[PDB]
């Protein structure tokens, strides 16, 4: 069972950035497709920037957990 647990954890930590980049991207794309005015767009630019920062945070977390999971003593 430990092998299954480990592979699950590894795959989750590996796909975390892909999710942050793809599904939240689809949400942003829905919003872009639906919005027309200028005030809402001005306010949504900051959401896009926050998504940038969140993607970088997820990438850092994944890097940390992956260097923990792929570190061998011998």
């Amino acid at each position: 069972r430990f092998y299954f647990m480990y592979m699950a954890r590894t795959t989750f930590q590996a796909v975390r950035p892909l999710l942050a980049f793809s599904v939240f991207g689809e949400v942003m794309k829905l919003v872009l497709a639906t919005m027309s005015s200028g005030l809402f767009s001005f306010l949504f630019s900051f959401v896009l920037a926050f998504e940038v920062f969140y993607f970088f945070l997820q990438c850092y977390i994944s890097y940390t957990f992956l260097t923990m999971f792929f570190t061998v003593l011998f």
Partner: protein
């Protein structure tokens, strides 16, 4: 029997008085009698902070 009427009262001898309430009443009655799904629908509205651009 010579006239096309249901009763003997042919209405008032003076025209109505202008009234927002009477106008709204008549408009609502006409809308109900027509029963048209699509009245008041606005497919495109000029984008503006004002609710009704122009009017």
């Amino acid at each position: 029997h010579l006239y096309n009427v249901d009763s003997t009262d042919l209405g008032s001898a003076v025209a109505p008085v202008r009234s927002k309430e009477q106008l709204d009443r008549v408009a609502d009655s006409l809308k109900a009698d027509l029963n048209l799904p699509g009245y008041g629908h606005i497919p495109y509205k000029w984008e503006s902070l004002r609710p009704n651009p122009g009017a």
